[PDB]
Structure formats: structure tokens, C-alpha cells
Amino acid sequence: LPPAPRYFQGENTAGFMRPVRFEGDITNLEVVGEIPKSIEGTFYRVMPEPHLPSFIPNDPWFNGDGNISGFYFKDGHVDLKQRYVRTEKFVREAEARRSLLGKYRNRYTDLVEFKIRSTANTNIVYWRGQLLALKEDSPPYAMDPETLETFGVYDFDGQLPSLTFTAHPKFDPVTREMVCFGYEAKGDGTRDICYYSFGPDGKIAETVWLVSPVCGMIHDFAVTENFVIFPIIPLVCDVERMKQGGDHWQWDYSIPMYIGVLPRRGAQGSDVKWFEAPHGFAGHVANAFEDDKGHIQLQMAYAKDNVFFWWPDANGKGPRPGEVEAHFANFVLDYQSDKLPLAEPTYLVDDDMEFPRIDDRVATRKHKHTFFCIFDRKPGVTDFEFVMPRAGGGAPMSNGLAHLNHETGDIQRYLPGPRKLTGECIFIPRNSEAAEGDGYVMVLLANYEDMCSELAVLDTKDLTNEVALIKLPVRLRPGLHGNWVDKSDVDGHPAPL
Amino acid sequence: LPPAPRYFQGENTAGFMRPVRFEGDITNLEVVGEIPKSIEGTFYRVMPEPHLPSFIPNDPWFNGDGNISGFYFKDGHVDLKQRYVRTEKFVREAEARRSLLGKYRNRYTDLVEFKIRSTANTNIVYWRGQLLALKEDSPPYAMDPETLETFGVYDFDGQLPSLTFTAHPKFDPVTREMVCFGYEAKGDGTRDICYYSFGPDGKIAETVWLVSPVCGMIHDFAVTENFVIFPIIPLVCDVERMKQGGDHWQWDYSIPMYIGVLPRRGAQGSDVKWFEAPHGFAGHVANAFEDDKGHIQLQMAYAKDNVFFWWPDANGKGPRPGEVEAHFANFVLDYQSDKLPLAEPTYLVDDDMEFPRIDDRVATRKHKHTFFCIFDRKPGVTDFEFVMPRAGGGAPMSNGLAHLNHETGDIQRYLPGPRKLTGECIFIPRNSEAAEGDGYVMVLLANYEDMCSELAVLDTKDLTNEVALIKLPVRLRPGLHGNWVDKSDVDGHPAPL
Numbered sequence: 006l007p008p009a010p011r012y013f014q015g016e017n018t019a020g021f022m023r024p025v026r027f028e029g030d031i032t033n034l035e036v037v038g039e040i041p042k043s044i045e046g047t048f049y050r051v052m053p054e055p056h057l058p059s060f061i062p063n064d065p066w067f068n069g070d071g072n073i074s075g076f077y078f079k080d081g082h083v084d085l086k087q088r089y090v091r092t093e094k095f096v097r098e099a100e101a102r103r104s105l106l107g108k109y110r111n112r113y114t115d116l117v118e119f120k121i122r123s124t125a126n127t128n129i130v131y132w133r134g135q136l137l138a139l140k141e142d143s144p145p146y147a148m149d150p151e152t153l154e155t156f157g158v159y160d161f162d163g164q165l166p167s168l169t170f171t172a173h174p175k176f177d178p179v180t181r182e183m184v185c186f187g188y189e190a191k192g193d194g195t196r197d198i199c200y201y202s203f204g205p206d207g208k209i210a211e212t213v214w215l216v217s218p219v220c221g222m223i224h225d226f227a228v229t230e231n232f233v234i235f236p237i238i239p240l241v242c243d244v245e246r247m248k249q250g251g252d253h254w255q256w257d258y259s260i261p262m263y264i265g266v267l268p269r270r271g272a273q274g275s276d277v278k279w280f281e282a283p284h285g286f287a288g289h290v291a292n293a294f295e296d297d298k299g300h301i302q303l304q305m306a307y308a309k310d311n312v313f314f315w316w317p318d319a320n321g322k323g324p325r326p327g328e329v330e331a332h333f334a335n336f337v338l339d340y341q342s343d344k345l346p347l348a349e350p351t352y353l354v355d356d357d358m359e360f361p362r363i364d365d366r367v368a369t370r371k372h373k374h375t376f377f378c379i380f381d382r383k384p385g386v387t388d389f390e391f392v393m394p395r396a397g398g399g400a401p402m403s404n405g406l407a408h409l410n411h412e413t414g415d416i417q418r419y420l421p422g423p424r425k426l427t428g429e430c431i432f433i434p435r436n437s438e439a440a441e442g443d444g445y446v447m448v449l450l451a452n453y454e455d456m457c458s459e460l461a462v463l464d465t466k467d468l469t470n471e472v473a474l475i476k477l478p479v480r481l482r483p484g485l486h487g488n489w490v491d492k493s494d495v496d497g498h499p500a501p502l
Numbered sequence: 503l504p505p506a507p508r509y510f511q512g513e514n515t516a517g518f519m520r521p522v523r524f525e526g527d528i529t530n531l532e533v534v535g536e537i538p539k540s541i542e543g544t545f546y547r548v549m550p551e552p553h554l555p556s557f558i559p560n561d562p563w564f565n566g567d568g569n570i571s572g573f574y575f576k577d578g579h580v581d582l583k584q585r586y587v588r589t590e591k592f593v594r595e596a597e598a599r600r601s602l603l604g605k606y607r608n609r610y611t612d613l614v615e616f617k618i619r620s621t622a623n624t625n626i627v628y629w630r631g632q633l634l635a636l637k638e639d640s641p642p643y644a645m646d647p648e649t650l651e652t653f654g655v656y657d658f659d660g661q662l663p664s665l666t667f668t669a670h671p672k673f674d675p676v677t678r679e680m681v682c683f684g685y686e687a688k689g690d691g692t693r694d695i696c697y698y699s700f701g702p703d704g705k706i707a708e709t710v711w712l713v714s715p716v717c718g719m720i721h722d723f724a725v726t727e728n729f730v731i732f733p734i735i736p737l738v739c740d741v742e743r744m745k746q747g748g749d750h751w752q753w754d755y756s757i758p759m760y761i762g763v764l765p766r767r768g769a770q771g772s773d774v775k776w777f778e779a780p781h782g783f784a785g786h787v788a789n790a791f792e793d794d795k796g797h798i799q800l801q802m803a804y805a806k807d808n809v810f811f812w813w814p815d816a817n818g819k820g821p822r823p824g825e826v827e828a829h830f831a832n833f834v835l836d837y838q839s840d841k842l843p844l845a846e847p848t849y850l851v852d853d854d855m856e857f858p859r860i861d862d863r864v865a866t867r868k869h870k871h872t873f874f875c876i877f878d879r880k881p882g883v884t885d886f887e888f889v890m891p892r893a894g895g896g897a898p899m900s901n902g903l904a905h906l907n908h909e910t911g912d913i914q915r916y917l918p919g920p921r922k923l924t925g926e927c928i929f930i931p932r933n934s935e936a937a938e939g940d941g942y943v944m945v946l947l948a949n950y951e952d953m954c955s956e957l958a959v960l961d962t963k964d965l966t967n968e969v970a971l972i973k974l975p976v977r978l979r980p981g982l983h984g985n986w987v988d989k990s991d992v993d994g995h996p997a998p999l
């Protein structure tokens with residue numbers, strides 16, 4: 006077997022990216038300022054965090070074992086519980102005390118045969134009294150929201166029709182449905198998309214098999230009252246490349262950014278229309294809705310080049326680190342149209358942005374508030390000379406949050422400071438009566454001065470001001486997605502506006 | 503109630519002294535070099551680590567909640583398990599989410615009435631399949647060696663005769679007895695010492711009540727084949743001072759360092775002889791033994807002034823921080839003598855030293871190896887300019903270990919480096935055949951460059967060289983005592999030489 010390193014090496018595990026790999030509890034976190042005493046619930050987030058040094062040099066950030074953080078808030082007090090998802094990979098590597106899973110989404114490089122290759126490291130959502138730890142190459146792993154115990158790989162009472170479950174399911178606040186899909190839904194390199202939904206009682210509702218024009222990465226999707234929308238990142242899979250030890254994903258400069266539209270209910274696979282947006286990178290969906298004329302307004306991060314630059318084209322052509330900006334785009338789609346090519350999108354702000362969140366009380370409907378990460382290169386905002394030598398590599402950088410009011414066009418920007426960066430934020434309704442986008446925003450900060458993490462609590466009345474700064478004495482490595490589960494929501498999801 | 507602060511303030515909780523307060527697991531610790539594959543067992547250490555900010559300003563380091571670290575070694579792999587002792591204080595404060603216990607050893611300052619005031623934060627020893635978490639004002643807390651679960655306050659099957667159990671019991675390697683005492687054994691300010699022992703079957707053997715000439719701190723003691731020896735630190739307790747909110751302990755410049763000698767077996771309290779050593783501070787006992795003439799050779803750290811300078815005399819007179827040195831002293835005692843005053847001791851090395859360990863296979867008998875902490879002010883050994891601003895306050899500093907061979911007089915010094923400090927070391931016999939003092943030394947390092955802890959593994963054949971450096975990604979706050987439990991020892995203690 007290729008030897009197992011006994012300590013982490015390489016930029017992807019240097020400085021703030023160095024794995025900590027702790028599981029357990031820190032109760033009564035230190036607080037500067039005051040956590041509003043009416044906040045009650047849990048902020049769950051997932052980070053990739055390799056449990057053992059990889060035998061793959063410069064293993065991408067997306068290949069690290071999913072470690073779940075819960076921040077449990079009550080009466081202005083907050084406790085941290087932290088635990089790794091017990092994936093097949095985690096358990097067998099813990100047993101062997103060495104890495105066994107090889108390259109990102111390439112089973113031909115594994116040192117043993119895995120049934121499930123999930124790192125469960127992308128998103129952590131609440132569904133019918135369980136957490137679901139998501140990774141788009143796999144079914145979910147079900148976990149206990151209170152103890153973070155892993156129950157096991159989850160197949161929805163044997164109803165899961167797909168080998169894959171997206172990291173970005175949508176929760177319809179009116180129907181209480183979880184709207185899902187998986188791509189490569191029949192295995193490596195398949196063009197099968199399985200679109201499926203679950204009613205609030207846990208019974209499968211929709212199941213539609215459709216076919217992607219290419220085997221492309223469908224990381225996120227969008228749901229409106231009557232449609233589901235599949236934006237394809239022009240990263241393309243060739244299993245023959247994988248069998249020779251090559252990358253699962255390879256950029257294709259020659260294809261459009263496909264945007265598939267399928268009727269939400271009662272459709273067959275052949276009903277999908279593959280619209281062709283100008284070539285670019287499909288970033289995260291803020292939200293989509295039908296306007297009065299029944300046109301789909303799809304609002305999402307959109308870049309003009311390969312954000313995942315470590316997977317370039319067949320000739321190694323691609324951007325450098327920190328070169329590609331993504332912009333908050335509005336695409337207009339008409340399912341009735343037979344024109345496949347789409348206009349350039351309009352842009353809602355100028356900021357280099359990503360990780361958009363809305364008030365999920367209006368998910369699939371007209372939203373007028375978006376909270377998102379921004380990366381501002383304007384001199385002074387980030388002390389790059391101090392931060393970059395401490396930052397390591399492999400993870401995106403965000404040096405603020407912005408709140409866009411879509412009606413007034415007003416933008417508020419939160420800047421944690423010149424030696425801090427942010428993760429993805431969550432939005433918390435002030436209470437069950439609160440107006441759209443009124444309440445609290447929380448975001449995890451990397452503090453490069455202390456080499457510690459902090460959890461910032463902001464009031465939407467003034468995003469520029471920290472109401473509380475929760476001071477962790479450890480690092481939480483830069484992570485991916487997270488969700489708020491309010492104690493007042495019995496099913497874990499907020500009530501429709 | 504006096505308000506509970508929501509974050510740590512004061513020098514005692516700044517820099518490397520900032521509480522982390524994590525409980526749980528970090529498995530498969532990063533290793534630079536190679537842990538000898540034949541090492542099998544667990545290094546247990548305890549640190550004071552306040553779980554909640556004190557309402558007492560500049561609460562001394564000795565008043566922090568005991569947090570137990572276990573380093574579990576097998577086949578060159580090591581895992582950390584970390585858990586707080588569930589003392590009455592820990593449990594009630596966790597319930598209230600605020601500090602309730604007041605000043606060090608002063609119940610008159612507590613915000614509620616405690617039955618047991620233990621922080622269980624001084625030593626962690628193995629006895630008949632349990633850990634005992636020790637604090638000299640209390641009975642032990644019994645814990646599970648594998649899970650670090652707290653069973654509860656331990657009374658040895660109802661046999662414990664004393665309110666108090668020393669942090670420094672001695673394990674007789676020939677008789678397999680645990681030799682114990684407690685001072686203030688009948689409550690605050692009592693001069694009662696209870697000397698007691700347990701046979702390897704768990705049955706109490708000795709129980710002798712005697713009387714201290716003053717109510718003085720008896721932190722450590724010594725055991726030989728035929729004697730037990732009680733060195734009294736000239737810190738003296740007045741309950742009337744405590745009732746007004748004053749300190750439990752106050753230096754008395756006017757008394758000798760009393761050294762009581764009692765026959766080990768069959769004695770009455772009146773059989774104690776209170777020898778009078780020159781005024782000074784009784785530091786930790788390395789070991790004591792009888793020579794051929796049956797005279798006690800007592801080897802211990804000894805200073806000429808108050809090491810615990812934060813508890814000065816009645817007029818606030820005493821040393822400044824970093825002023826008092828302790829030296830490795832040999833006192834000679836003859837139980838037969840009626841001369842109470844004792845000569846100045848001889849000194850075995852010149853180093854400012856403390857935390858002496860021997861090969862416990864010769865405990866209570868002639869030893870010829872001692873391992874100890876040194877503090878060397880020789881320019882360059884510690885980069886004080888870098889370390890002091892990052893160190894916080896309240897804890898002693900050690901910038902190396904020394905191995906003294908008592909036969910050859912050879913000293914080897916381990917220097918972890920200019921920006922690292924050490925805790926108390928443990929000694930591990932190479933195997934059950936190994937000569938006295940032959941095997942491995944482990945010591946926890948504070949790395950002020952990384953603000954991380956490391957666990958150094960040294961071979962006694964060359965103490966200057968790290969065979970392995972285990973790299974923790976978190977801080978373990980400076981702690982007190984620790985012990986090795988070898989997997990090859992059925993009762994957790996090594997076999998006699």
C-alpha cells in the first residue's frame with residue numbers, strides 16, 4: 006500500500022486549514038456583547054476535515070471527512086457540540102488507522118472497495134426529526150440532532166430511487182415538501198438525473214428520471230411553484246479518464262451553461278427543456294420564483310470562468326487562484342419558449358459574491374431579501390500580507406456579508422475586519438410574526454490574528470454591527486453549508502409568510 | 503449575587519492560560535518522528551481549567567476545575583481523550599451556568615453551600631481498576647480509566663477515615679499498598695493529620711490520628727520501609743481570618759519547616775517526632791529511603807522563601823514572581839535522635855528545579871535516578887521577550903528536564919527549545935526487565951510559537967533527543983501531576999526491581 010503520512014503536509018492543511026479533528030463539547034462559550042435572549046434553536050454547519058493524512062498529495066478541500074458543528078442557543082447562552090459523520094470511509098479508515106479512500110470521486114484509486122464513498126461534508130439539513138449529512142455522490146447520512154450520533158446511510162424507508170442525493174434540497178414553506186434530485190443518479194459518468202420529492206409525512210411524491218445532454222456537475226438547483234430548474238456547471242465526467250487515474254471532473258470551454266426546466270408535478274423525463282445560457286459557472290442558487298407573466302426568475306451566483314480552477318480543461322487551460330469573480334445574476338426562463346439560447350443575465354449587485362441565503366419562509370416564491378458572502382479586493386479591506394501566509398489553500402475566501410433589499414436596492418455590508426474571513430451565513434426570523442428578512446444573521450469567522458474561530462451575531466436592522474461575538478478557543482476549519490433549526494418550528498422549518 | 507462574567511479576564515486566563523474547556527476525543531494524533539511500537543499504556547494528566555468565569559478576580563490557578571487528559575498508546579499510535587471530573591462544584595455550576603464556589607479553600611465565600619468543594623485538579627492516579635482525581639481538601643473522585651466517566655466522590659467502600667486525601671499518595675512496589683494521609687483531616691483549620699494505607703485487596707491497613715504543631719500545609723509526604731515523613735510548608739490556616747473572607751493560607755516567617763517522622767506500622771499519634779528543618783518551603787518529594795544505619799534520606803525540592811508568594815505573611819510581606827528558586831535537597835533524619843533541630847540539607851544539583859520523578863519500581867527504597875523540571879535563566883534557553891507576553895500568569899515555568907544519575911553524578915538536560923516550556927514528566931520502564939531509570943520519558947510542551955501543546959517522547963539513553971513529538975492542534979493549559987499506567991501491569995503499577 007502507498008505509505009500513510011503520520012502528520013499533515015501541503016498548503017491544503019497548512020495554517021488555518023490545519024485539521025484539528027476534535028469531537029465532543031465546549032459548553033458556555035465566551036461571549037463579547039449580548040446574544041438576544043429570545044434566540045432559541047441550533048446552528049448546524051459541516052466542514053470537510055480529513056480525520057487521517059491522505060496518501061493523495063494536495064487532496065482537494067471537498068474530499069475531507071464531514072465534521073458537524075452544532076451551536077445550541079437558549080436564554081443568551083450557547084454550547085458547541087462537534088462530531089464526525091460515521092461514513093463507511095470514516096469508520097473503515099478509523100479501524101485501519103490510515104487513509105484508504107483515494108482521489109475525489111474516483112473509486113479506481115481507492116485502496117479497498119467502498120459500497121458508499123460519501124464524506125457527508127457539504128450540507129447538514131433537518132428533516133422529520135433527523136439531521137441529513139449530504140454529499141452529492143451519495144445518499145444522505147441520518148444523524149441525531151441532539152447528540153450528533155450517526156444512525157447510518159439513509160434511504161427514506163427504502164423509497165430513495167437514486168444512488169445520489171443533492172447537497173441542496175429545497176424546503177417548500179407552503180407544502181412542507183422536501184424537493185430533491187441526484188445527478189449521476191445511476192453511478193459514475195451516467196447522464197441520469199432523478200428528480201424526487203417527499204411530503205411532510207415522509208412519503209415519496211415525485212419521481213422523474215431525465216437525461217442531461219452531458220455528464221455535467223449539477224451542484225445546486227431551483228424550485229418554483231410549478232417548475233424545477235437544473236443549472237449544469239460545464240465540468241464533465243469521463244469514466245475512461247477515471248479508470249486511468251484521472252480526475253472525475255474536467256472543464257469543457259466548448260459547451261453552454263445548460264439550464265434544464267421540468268414541470269414540478271406529473272412530468273415525464275422527455276418534458277425537460279435544456280436552455281443554453283452563455284458559457285459560465287453555475288454557483289449557488291439564492292432562490293427562483295414565477296413572476297406574474299409565469300416567467301422563472303432564477304437568481305444565482307454566476308461566473309464567466311471555472312471557479313473550480315484545480316479541474317481545468319483537457320489541455321490544462323483554466324484560471325489562477327483568486328482570479329474568478331462570481332456575480333449575483335438574474336436569468337429569465339420561459340418553459341413555453343422554444344428558443345433554447347438565453348440572453349446574458351442581468352446582475353443585482355457589483356460585488357464578487359457567493360453563498361446566498363434568503364428568508365426560507367418565501368423559498369420557491371418572490372423574495373426581496375438576499376444575504377451573501379462578498380470578497381472585496383479594494384485595498385485595506387483584507388490585510389492579505391498578514392492573512393495569506395496563515396490561510397493555507399483550497400477554500401474560497403469571503404471578507405464580508407451583504408444584505409440586498411431587492412425593492413429599495415439598498416445594500417448593507419458587514420466587514421468583520423482586516424484579519425478575519427467569513428463562512429456562509431444563516432438567517433433567523435426575529436419571531437414567527439417577523440417581516441421577511443427581519444431578525445438575526447449568524448456567520449462563523451476565521452480570526453487569523455488569534456488563529457481562533459468566532460461566531461458573529463448580527464441584527465438585520467444594522468448588519469454593520471456585531472450584537473454578540475462568540476469566541477471559540479479552537480479553530481473550526483473553513484466549511485461549507487449550514488442551517489438554522491428554530492426551537493419554535495416543531496418540524497425544524499419556518500412557517501410560510 | 504455578584505455578577506458572572508461571560509468571558510475570561512485577568513492575567514491568570516490570558517495567552518496560553520486562556521481556558522479551552524473542551525471535552526471529548528482527538529484520535530490518531532499527528533506524530534513527527536516515531537513512537538516506539540512496544541510502548542503500551544496511558545499517560546493521564548490533570549490541569550486546573552475553569553469551566554466558567556469566576557466571580558473572584560485573579561482566582562489562583564489551583565482553584566480551576568480539574569480536566570483529565572488521557573494519551574492512549576498502542577503500536578506507535580496515540581489517541582487523546584479529555585473530560586472534566588464531575589465534582590459537586592462542576593455539576594452545580596454547569597446546572598446554574600455560572601460560578602458558585604468562591605475563594606480557594608474558603609467555604610465562607612461560596613454563593614451556595616457545598617458538601618464537597620474539590621476541583622479534583624491536582625493529581626490523577628490509578629488504584630484497583632479506577633482513576634482517583636485528587637485534591638488535598640477532599641476525598642478522591644473515582645473515574646473510569648477507559649471512558650473518563652466520573653463515578654463520584656470515593657470513600658474506599660466506606661473505609662475512608664479522613665475528610666481529606668493527599669494529592670501525593672505513595673505506591674509501595676513490594677507490598678502493593680497505597681500509602682495515604684490527609685491534613686485538616688477534621689475540617690477547616692484543624693491540626694489533625696490522619697495517616698492511612700490500603701492493601702492491594704482494597705482493605706484499610708494503617709489508620710493513625712496525629713497532631714501537627716501548627717495548622718500548616720502538608721502538600722506532599724514521604725514513605726520508607728519503616729517510616730512516613732510529613733514536611734510542613736510554613737503556610738498556616740486561621741479559620742477566623744477565613745470567616746471574614748480572608749485567605750485559607752498565610753506565610754509565617756517565625757516557624758521552622760517542620761518534618762514529622764512516624765513509624766509506618768503499629769504507631770500511635772504520640773509516636774510522631776516533629777523535627778525542625780531551617781525555615782523554608784517544602785516542595786515535592788522525589789523519594790525517601792532508609793540507609794544501612796536506618797537513617798531516613800529525604801530527597802525533595804526545598805526553597806528558602808514562600809514559593810506561593812500570592813499568600814504572603816500577616817503584613818503582606820513575601821517574594822515577587824520568579825524570585826524564589828527551589829533546589830534538590832537531601833535531609834537526613836534519625837527517628838532515634840531527640841535533637842529536634844536539623845542541619846541545612848545537602849543539594850544534589852545546582853538547578854532551579856521541581857516536579858521530581860523517580861523509577862516508581864524503587865519508591866520507598868534506595869533510588870539512583872531522578873527526572874525533574876528545571877528553570878534555567880541562562881541567556882537564550884528561553885526567549886523571554888517572545889514567551890512572557892504570550893504566557894499569561896499564575897503557573898510555574900519549566901524550560902527543561904534533567905536526568906540525574908545519583909551514582910555517577912552525570913546530568914542530562916532536555917531543552918525543548920527557546921519558545922517552549924514543559925510540564926511534569928513521566929517515566930516508563932523500557933519493559934519489565936529494564937534496569938532502574940532505563941526506558942522512556944514523556945512530557946507535555948507548551949509551544950508559544952504555535953500556541954499549541956505537544957507531547958515529547960524521549961529515550962533515557964539520550965534525554966537530549968526527541969524520539970517522537972506528538973503535535974496537538976489545541977492547547978492543553980499548564981497542568982499539575984500525571985501518571986503512566988502500563989498495559990502490562992495488571993494493577994496499573996510497575997513490578998518491584
Ligand SMILES: [Cl-]
Nearest residue numbers: 091154155156
Ligand atoms: Cl455514531
Ligand SMILES: [Cl-]
Nearest residue numbers: 588651652653
Ligand atoms: Cl461523568
Ligand SMILES: [Fe+2]
Nearest residue numbers: 172224289486
Ligand atoms: Fe454547495
Ligand SMILES: [Fe+2]
Nearest residue numbers: 669721786983
Ligand atoms: Fe503537587
